[PDB]
Design goal:
Three copies of one chain form a homotrimer. Chain A has 106 residues and is mainly α. Chain A contains five helices and no strands. The radius of gyration of chain A is 14 Å and the shape is elongated. Chains in contact: A-B, A-C, B-C. The A-B interface holds A 56, 59-60, 63-64, 66-67, 70-71, 73-74, 77-78, 81, 86, 90, 93, 96, 100 and B 56, 59-60, 63-64, 66-67, 70-71, 73-74, 77, 81, 90, 93, 96, 100, 104. The structure holds heme C (HEC) (3 copies) and fe (iii) ion (2 copies). Chains A, B, C: Its cofactor is heme b.
């Protein structure tokens, strides 16, 4: 899919997780987040289009999505175990990984 | 090798990082951090000595080390790039991963 | 213990998994690879015996295992969910991680 539309998925489901009531809504949104993060990993960001796909920048770009996916995974484990407050707090801490990448590459 | 000692290695090198002046020092610290986080990840913390070796808690306990080693590696990228300030800022944000795990398992 | 032996562990159980018939068998074989991979994270490969432990080659090397540990963990999840076909496929897909690292470092 699109890297913008991947980022839309991630953003929209971060807010869903914000206002969730129960565990199934959080699980639902985290599962979409993981799939979008997995598709976004293989993209070339506009600001790196001119760089070798193995430049240190594309390597660092790829690396940020591995961290994001591990964090999504860990949050989903909380949601699965029915811990809606902790799952939501993991999702909030998630935000640092988005900001860190956007600062360098958006 | 002690889990207690791996955590002092993590806490001591974190301190050296934030007090470094030159990037090679940040690099050497982070590498021992990763080696200690990686030595720690097959330990069983006090709060979980009864738990089955593959209980949900032990499972999520291992997630945190994987996330932490990734984030260290991302600072090692900044370090290797001479950028010494923002490698300290990545090490700073790192503590949120420390804290999440401490708040469940320490 | 040996790096060589971690590799025979990874290679034998990859074969075990292809020929497995049920989720338990694939989970047992994945479990074995997860330990081999975690063990090998801290090995020094013969081609890098002259690199510092904090070199960018040694950190890219350990990164390959960090990735492999993550991909094994995802496959282990599928297995644990009885999805024997998908988990077997995810074990197949691991050879990309293997090949990238052999190319650079074997
Ligand atoms: C992923 C599932 C795999 C599989 C199936 C194999 N490897 Fe590796 N490997 C790495 C290095 C540095 C070596 C050289 C070791 C040495 O010379 O002592 C190897 C070697 C092997 C072998 C042995 C081949 C031989 O002729 O001796 C085999 C069978 C093998 N590999 C299979 C490094 C890595 C990795 C670095 C991160 C990763 C990941 C893998 N290997 C993954 C796999
Ligand atoms: C590289 C790692 C990376 C990570 C990790 C990441 N982003 Fe993105 N993000 C980008 C890039 C690059 C763009 C710019 C896309 C473009 O311009 O085509 C972007 C764009 C966006 C956009 C759309 C911006 C626009 O103007 O349309 C949103 C929304 C967004 N990010 C939010 C998020 C959220 C939410 C997360 C995680 C929960 C996240 N980002 C994680 C790299 C990342
Ligand atoms: C994924 C798990 C995990 C991560 C990541 C983690 N910790 Fe620990 N930490 C623990 C546990 C469990 C203990 C309790 C060990 C004990 O009391 O035996 C602990 C204890 C500590 C202690 C007290 C040590 C002592 O002997 O009193 C300090 C300081 C510490 N952590 C700092 C850190 C730092 C610094 C980091 C990373 C930079 C970190 N922690 C990351 C699990 C973790
Ligand atoms: Fe998991
Ligand atoms: Fe790297």
């Amino acid at each position: 899919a699109d890297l913008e539309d991947n980022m839309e998925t991630l953003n929209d489901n971060l807010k869903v997780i914000e206002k969730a009531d129960n565990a199934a809504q959080v699980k639902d949104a985290l599962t979409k987040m993981a799939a979008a993060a997995a598709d976004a990993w293989s993209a070339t960001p506009p600001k790196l289009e001119d760089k070798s796909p193995d430049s240190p920048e594309m390597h660092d770009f790829r690396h940020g999505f591995w961290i994001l996916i591990g964090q999504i995974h860990a949050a989903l484990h909380l949601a699965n175990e029915g811990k809606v407050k902790e799952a939501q707090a993991a999702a909030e801490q998630l935000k640092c990984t988005c900001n860190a990448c956007h600062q360098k590459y958006r």
